[PDB]
């Protein structure tokens, strides 16, 4: 329940629409490696978030999430396919609302949404 709706069903349906078959090509040609690198960054922040027990995001994880947004923008600039994927799934906007909420729960559902995106992207291939 992040924003507008944005849920795991949104992830499955958006991967379905952006899927096109010629071979299977998703999000105008996004390889699984770029998505895996993005998920690796997600894992790097998520491990630190999970290890801490307090329900409020610390300053360190907030700075790491701003870094994650910057990395998202860099990846979009590097490859058009990653840019189209980021725009169609609005991941950076979810990062922004996670920053706005300052709650561990919102980050956790954001990570769940990202993992659902990865899972459905692999499944439809």
């Amino acid at each position: 329940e992040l924003a507008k709706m944005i849920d795991l069903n949104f992830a499955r349906k958006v991967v379905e629409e952006n899927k096109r078959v010629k071979e299977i090509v998703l999000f105008n040609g996004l390889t699984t490696s770029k998505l895996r690198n993005l998920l690796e960054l997600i894992n790097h922040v998520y491990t630190k978030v999970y290890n801490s027990d307090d329900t409020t995001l610390s300053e360190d994880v907030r700075d790491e999430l701003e870094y994650l947004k910057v990395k998202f923008a860099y990846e979009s600039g590097r490859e058009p396919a990653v840019r189209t994927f980021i725009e169609k799934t609005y991941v950076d906007k979810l990062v922004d609302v996670v920053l706005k909420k300052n709650t561990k729960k919102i980050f956790l559902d954001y990570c769940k949404y990202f993992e659902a995106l990865v899972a459905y992207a692999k499944f439809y291939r």
Binding site: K112, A116, V118, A119, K122
Partner: protein
């Protein structure tokens, strides 16, 4: 109830504790008990032109388990099954209150048999894959469904079976049906 039931259960490891009056108390191997309960339901529908219904409860207990506890717990199962509307089969845990058509076809026919044939035909996957699917399905969190998809992506299974498993996991009733089919197959494939 008395003369025909002996013919009904012939060939199965069943010891009829008592046909009594209308109620039937029966003890045997779990596989044979369930199969013969289904055959009994079908024969009971054939008899009396299908205007009579009967509710049954099936319970799983270890061999060393006391008989009194087996009787009491299966009785509570049948009480829960008859608590619903007309015929029900309260197989195993109270959360598995099924119907006769549902158990015979929707559980042991459309789901169990494809899983079995995939297991025996495949040379790479075994019981651990089924246990992973069961762990995914038992979890109530939605994300698990997506995880299931990922597993089914690298499962090397047939595409038709993959899509059917995904569809079953999406729906609630079909999810519990697939859970029961997986548990039954694991029980049948143990040791």
């Amino acid at each position: 109830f008395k003369f025909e039931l002996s013919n009904i259960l012939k060939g199965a490891r069943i010891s009829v504790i008592y046909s009594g009056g209308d109620d039937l108390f029966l003890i045997g191997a779990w596989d044979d008990v369930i199969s013969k309960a289904l055959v009994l339901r079908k024969a009971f529908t054939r008899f009396s032109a299908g205007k009579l219904t009967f509710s049954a409860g099936i319970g799983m207990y270890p061999v060393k388990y006391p008989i009194s506890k087996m009787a009491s717990e299966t009785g509570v199962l049948e009480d829960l099954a008859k608590r619903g509307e007309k015929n029900q089969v309260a197989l195993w845990n109270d959360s598995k209150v099924f119907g006769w058509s549902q158990l015979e076809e929707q559980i042991l026919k459309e789901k169990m048999i494809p899983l079995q044939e995939a297991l025996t035909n495949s040379q790479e996957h075994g019981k651990s894959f089924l246990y992973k699917m069961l762990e995914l399905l038992r979890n109530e969190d939605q994300i698990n469904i997506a995880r299931l998809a990922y597993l089914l992506a690298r499962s090397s299974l047939s595409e038709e079976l993959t899509q059917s498993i995904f569809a079953w996991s999406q729906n609630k009733q079909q999810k519990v049906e697939l859970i029961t089919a997986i548990e039954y197959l694991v029980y049948q494939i143990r040791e």
